[PDB]
Structure formats: C-alpha cells, structure tokens
Amino acid sequence: KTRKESYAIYVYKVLKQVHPDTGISSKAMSIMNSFVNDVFERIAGEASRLAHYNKRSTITSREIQTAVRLLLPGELAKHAVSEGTKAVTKYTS
Amino acid sequence: TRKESYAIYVYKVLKQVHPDTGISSKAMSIMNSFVNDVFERIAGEASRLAHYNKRSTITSREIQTAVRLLLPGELAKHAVSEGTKAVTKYT
Amino acid sequence: RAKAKTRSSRAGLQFPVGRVHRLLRKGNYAERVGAGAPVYLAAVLEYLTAEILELAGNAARDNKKTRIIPRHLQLAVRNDEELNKLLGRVTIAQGGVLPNIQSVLL
Amino acid sequence: KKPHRYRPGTVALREIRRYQKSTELLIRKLPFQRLVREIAQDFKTDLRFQSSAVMALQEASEAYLVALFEDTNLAAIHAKRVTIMPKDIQLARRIRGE
Amino acid sequence: KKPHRYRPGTVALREIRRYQKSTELLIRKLPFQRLVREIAQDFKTDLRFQSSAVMALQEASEAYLVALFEDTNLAAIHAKRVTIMPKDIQLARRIRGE
Amino acid sequence: LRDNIQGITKPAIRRLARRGGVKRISGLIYEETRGVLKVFLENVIRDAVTYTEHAKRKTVTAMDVVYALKRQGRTLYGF
Amino acid sequence: LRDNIQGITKPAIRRLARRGGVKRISGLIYEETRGVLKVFLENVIRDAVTYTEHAKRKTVTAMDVVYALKRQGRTLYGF
DNA sequence: CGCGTACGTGCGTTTAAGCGGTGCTAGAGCTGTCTACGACCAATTGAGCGGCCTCGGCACCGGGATTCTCCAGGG
DNA sequence: CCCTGGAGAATCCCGGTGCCGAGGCCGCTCAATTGGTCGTAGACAGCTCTAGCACCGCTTAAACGCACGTACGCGC
C-alpha cells in the first residue's frame, strides 16, 4: 500500500549497535519515532528561526549547531556538538 | 536603511476608537512587539496547519483555524466575525 | 554513473541523511538547506536515540527484562537529569511517573 | 478471634507502590469515552472519535492529572499536612498558569 | 516624647501599593549590569553588552522574580502563614517545572 | 448524553492519586478534579475540533489529538 | 569580576517582594532569591551567548535577548 | 495556648548609583568582489516496507516461599 | 509505656503453556543516489562612525548595621 515515513528500523539499528542482546516492542518503537520527530521539528524550527533572525536564506551546519545548544542544556549539549562535528568532518573527508 | 514597523498603523486604529488620547514611544514599541509576536504565532500555526493536512497553500481558513486555536473564549469568535466581514468586503 | 553509496555510511552514521535533508526542504523551514545541515541533524538525533536506548536497556536489565517496554523509556528519561529537563513538558504514554516516596510519607 | 484491622495509610502507601510501578491505565475506557462525546457534543454535533483517538486522549489526561496530583501532594507536606485539600489543587493551577 | 512607632506590617502594605502602581525599576542598574558580565564571562571572555541589552535582561528578570514572589506569597496563606520561606520558592519552581 | 462527569469514579480518582504519591485524599477532592478534568478536556477537544474541521473531516483522529496537545506544551509520545 | 552576586542588595530583594504582594520577608530568602536569579540569568544569557556567536557578533544586542527569552516562553515586549 | 527569636520599624553612618563629561578603540553596517553551493534537470538504483513465515518473552496459572508487618506477652 | 516472639495476608521468585506480537525474509518500487549547470547567498577585504568601555566629582538617595518589641513561626 502507501508507504509512511517512520524511523522504526533506524532506532532498531541504533539499539542493536550498543545493545545487541535486547529487543523492543512496537509501542516503544512508536514512542521513539514520536521522540525523533518532535526533536526534529524543534531543531529545524529553531534553525529556520535562526536563518530568518540573521536575514539568511540557507540553513548550514552552524544553524544546527546553534539550535542544539539552545534546546539541549549543558552536559548533554557538548556530546551532540562533538558527534555533530565529527560527522561533518567525516562527511567532508 | 529602512526598518519595517507598525507604529503608524496602531496610531490610525487608536484615533478610530479613541481620538482623545495619544501614545508614547515605549508604548508604541510594546504594541509593535505585540503585533509581531502574534504575527509569528498565527502564521506559525497556519504554516503548521498546512503541513498537517499536506496543504501547499495557506488560505483564509488557515488563519481562521489558527485564531480559534490561539485566542480563547469569545475573543476568537469576535475576530472570526471581524475576519469574515473583511473577506466579504473584499469581494 | 558511480556506485550509489549512501550518505549515512560516508559520515559513519546509521540515520538516513537523505531523508533528513528531504523533510528540511519540504517542511517549510528555509529557501535552501546546506550540505552539512542533514549530517549535523542526523548525528544529534542518533546521540539522543542512543543515549535514551542505553539507559532504557539499563532500566530493562534492572527488573530482568529483555523486551523494551514503554515504562523503560519513561524510566530512562526521568532518571537522567538532562533528559528530565529536555522532556519536562513531554507526556509519555504507558509510562506513568517515577516510583518515589516522600521521606515524611513513611 | 480478631480481625486484621489495617491502620489507614499503610495500605495507601502500599497502593502507591503498586500503582507507581504499574503500567496499565487506572480509569476505565468506557466511562472516559462517554465523557469525551458529551463534552464534544456541546461544541459540534454528529462528531465521532476513533478508538486510538480516545486512547491518546485518555493517556494524556491521566498523566496531566497525575502530575497535578504530585504537585498537590508536595504542597500538602509543605503546609505541614498529610491529606490533600481542594484548595491545594486551586493553588497548583494558579502557580502553573492554568 | 514618643515616636509614632508604626506597627510591624503597616509599612509593608504601604510599599505594596506604591510599587504595584509605579513602574520604576527596583533593582539598581549597575549592580545588575556587572552581574551579567561575570555570568557571561564563563561562556565568553571577550564579550560586550549593549545599554539596551542589559536593559532588556533586567526587566525580564524583575518580572520573573515578582511573578515567582507572587507564587511564593500565596503558598504561605496556603500553609497558614504570612512569611515567605525558601521552601516556598522551591515549591514554586518544582510546580512550574523550572 | 447527560451526567457524564460522574463517569470518573471516586476510586478512579483515588487510583490516580496513588500514582501521584498522595497519602490521603479528601472527600471534596473528587468533585474538584472532575471540574479540573472537564476544563482540561474542554480545551484539548475544542482544539482538536478545530483541527478536525480544518481537514474537512467528521471524525477526530489521534493525529489531531497530538497536535492539540502539542501547541499547549503538553506533547504526547506514542499517539 | 568577583563578588557580584551580592549586587542584588537586601532592600532590592525586599522591593521585588513588595511588588509581588509579599507582606513579610524572611532573612533566609535573600540567599535563595540570589540563587534563583543566578540560575535564571545563567540560562537566558547563555542562550543569548549562542545567538551572539551565530550572528558573527562579539557584542550581545537586545534583539538576541528577546529571541533567547522567546524560546523559553518568556517573551518580552518593548525590547 | 504558650515560647521565643527574628524579622518589622526606626534611623546613624558609610557607600556606591547615577548624571554629566572626557577619550578611544571594539566592532556592526555598508559597499564591492569573487566564489563555491544547492534547486533543478536527466539518469539511474537499492533497501525500506507491506506482508508472510517463524519464533520466543513474558502474561497467565498456580506453587511455593521468604519477608517485612501487626498483635499479644513480658519487663 | 517500650521491647520482642509468633502468625495473617499482600507480595516476590519460580515451574509449565503458548501465543500473539516481534524478528527475519521476498521483492520491488518509490524515494534515495550520481553527474552537470547555473543564479545566487555567502565569505572576504577596506571605511567608517556611532555606541560602549574605563575613569573622574559629587551628591544623594540607596544600602549595611544596631536597638527595641509585638505580629507571627513554631512547639504542644
């Protein structure tokens, strides 16, 4: 039928990466899919605001970097920045 | 440069219903901030409204639904009647 | 053309970079979306996914459970101080609240 | 012959431990579903709600009421009191801005 | 002679009526300005603040503290008291989610 | 449909407060929270009514319930 | 810059309580209000710091303070 | 209802907030300039997902058990 | 009135079923991937000029501190 967009298998791939001896129910899968989409709307909404606040037309990696510092506080923020920085450098290399 | 502002627009509305009173710059900047803050709230809700029903356009119904979502009580139905009367006076 | 190598494997990631880039363009956020914007967004989403699931697995092994239950996801969020602050105004279905008792209650 | 005669509070603490570690929903579906239709009929008639729509509405209602109940509980012990009061709920709504 | 000797609390409502109808800033500008710099020094050493930037920070903090003091005050009458306590402030932040 | 506010029974409120760690529950608490639940339901459903009427739909979906709760800072996970 | 948390003096906190309708002000509330104000300032300014770095500016403007307060549901009118 | 101490009130006294003034550079707009970048167009392509086969973790049903709690007896 | 021994009932670990939701497999198809091509936002270089940083005089309302007592917090 019609395909619907979801992160059912990507959360599964992340779960098996660090915890290869556990499973997950579909109810918990939908919560994780809800959690990913809600954070996705918050960061992209902040990145959309950040470009409009500086009269900029495009959203770069610094817009995502600035957005996650506003939402994620303190200790949780610096790992997201470090993982974000190491992903960009690996992508460009 | 030129700065977009609603300072003149609030002034004409003020003397429309109360021509015996003035306004200050601090009150005007507060009212300019009030108009801008509601502007992003209604349009942000309307933009989110179009994305929910897979709509690529924003119509008067998008603004109408966002008003009743944001404005509570009889304030929504008063703005709905004012909004409807502007569309009829348009056509 | 060349081999259709996914952008997730190029950045050492599992989350779909192309899918994240697609919803950025069609989500009515900006006129253009940069090249590194979906890469940065996927890395942040992966870390939040991995951190929650790691603590959920720790909560799953606390009560000797293999399957992840939505109580475990709620327990992972509330126990972590950063996850509690980030998701303070977030309601999780089938999660309840923390099983804590006041000191004067006993 | 002598009955057990549990003193008040201990079973209340026991019910706290049994329900805080539980997962299932305390309020039954049918009484909550009929309340939704009665409220919605005052706004728009001939309105239907899906089974998952009532399910989503019921989970959020319990969590909101539980979070209000936790704030009501710590307000009581702040006032050197054990039993919650209706004025404690009115205090919680005003501070929360609701 | 004998001084007027206002009773404890009479001047409190007199200051309540004065500050609730006048919009002057209670906190002095320079002590609040230098506090902002030492807070921002932990995040960026070479940082500057505009005159209106410190102005915008002060009124937001003043209204937040007054609103917190409003939630702090009615918690005392809820606790059969008239004096605010630090446990009332922690009650307000926990209920508000801060 | 009348007198449907009595559907939330007295031990159902007691069970909810047991989840909240409440030690003892007053007899006037049950009547108070029924109005509180009615007020809370009168806002989310009304917001979901506008969501349903905007999509030209006659049945309120669980998607509209989530968006009604999301705009008030009470987002629900798992739908 | 050191010893700046004491800039919010004892009558300054008392004046804020009088605006909020507080009748009696305790002697232990001055340390508590300073900690709450420091915690609140450590979030708004830090959010404004990230807005300043993204704008390629080395000075914090009042416009970024409004944006920092807006995302936390504390939007300020009059800038 | 009673104990009390600690915060309301009053001013002595010090102390910095603020107005006005001076100088200067830290730096945000402003204007060119040149430069990679992403939407869009052909061309193609590869595993996410609907669904089916399989399978296994814990709900259910009891059985048994330690295990923290209440009632009664003794000092 | 407080300390300690025995037992009623809610609660926890465990043996056996199996079952219905979860894990892996079959394609393939629709969204993800590859290459070119420009309009165009953005990084970069030089000017500048209007607002902020630092110090000075004073002066004065704001603030630290001490004496006294009664509204109120806390104990019973």
CSV table of C-alpha atoms (C1' of nucleotides) in Angstrom, one decimal, chain I residues 6-71:
chain,number,residue,atom,x,y,z
I,6,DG,C1',4.7,-15.7,66.5
I,7,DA,C1',1.4,-15.5,62.7
I,8,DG,C1',-2.4,-13.5,58.9
I,9,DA,C1',-2.2,-11.6,54.3
I,10,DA,C1',-0.1,-8.9,50.5
I,11,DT,C1',4.0,-9.6,47.8
I,12,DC,C1',8.0,-11.9,45.2
I,13,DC,C1',10.7,-16.0,42.8
I,14,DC,C1',9.8,-19.9,40.2
I,15,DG,C1',7.9,-24.4,37.0
I,16,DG,C1',4.9,-25.0,32.8
I,17,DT,C1',1.7,-23.2,28.4
I,18,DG,C1',1.8,-20.9,24.4
I,19,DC,C1',0.5,-17.1,21.9
I,20,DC,C1',0.3,-13.3,19.8
I,21,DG,C1',3.2,-9.6,18.9
I,22,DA,C1',8.2,-9.3,17.5
I,23,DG,C1',12.3,-10.8,14.2
I,24,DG,C1',13.9,-12.1,9.7
I,25,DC,C1',12.9,-13.0,4.9
I,26,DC,C1',10.7,-11.8,-0.8
I,27,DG,C1',10.5,-8.3,-4.0
I,28,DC,C1',10.4,-4.1,-5.8
I,29,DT,C1',9.3,0.4,-6.2
I,30,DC,C1',9.5,4.9,-4.8
I,31,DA,C1',12.3,7.6,-2.5
I,32,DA,C1',17.4,7.8,-2.2
I,33,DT,C1',21.7,8.2,-5.0
I,34,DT,C1',25.2,10.4,-9.3
I,35,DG,C1',26.5,14.0,-12.6
I,36,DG,C1',26.1,18.7,-14.8
I,37,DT,C1',24.5,23.8,-14.7
I,38,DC,C1',23.9,27.9,-13.5
I,39,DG,C1',21.6,32.3,-10.3
I,40,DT,C1',22.7,33.4,-6.2
I,41,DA,C1',23.7,33.7,-1.0
I,42,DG,C1',27.8,33.9,1.4
I,43,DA,C1',32.9,34.6,2.8
I,44,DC,C1',36.3,38.1,2.3
I,45,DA,C1',38.7,43.0,2.0
I,46,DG,C1',38.5,48.1,3.2
I,47,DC,C1',35.8,52.6,5.6
I,48,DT,C1',33.6,54.2,8.8
I,49,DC,C1',31.1,56.2,12.7
I,50,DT,C1',28.0,55.9,16.4
I,51,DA,C1',27.6,53.5,20.6
I,52,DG,C1',30.2,51.1,24.8
I,53,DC,C1',34.4,50.5,27.9
I,54,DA,C1',37.2,53.0,31.5
I,55,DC,C1',37.9,56.9,34.9
I,56,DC,C1',36.7,61.2,37.2
I,57,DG,C1',33.3,64.6,41.2
I,58,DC,C1',29.9,64.8,43.8
I,59,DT,C1',25.8,64.2,45.8
I,60,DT,C1',22.3,61.8,47.5
I,61,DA,C1',19.1,58.5,47.6
I,62,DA,C1',20.1,53.7,48.3
I,63,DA,C1',22.1,50.4,51.5
I,64,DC,C1',24.8,48.0,56.0
I,65,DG,C1',24.1,47.7,60.7
I,66,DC,C1',22.4,48.2,65.6
I,67,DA,C1',18.4,48.8,69.4
I,68,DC,C1',13.7,47.6,70.6
I,69,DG,C1',9.4,45.0,70.7
I,70,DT,C1',5.0,42.7,69.0
I,71,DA,C1',2.8,40.2,64.8
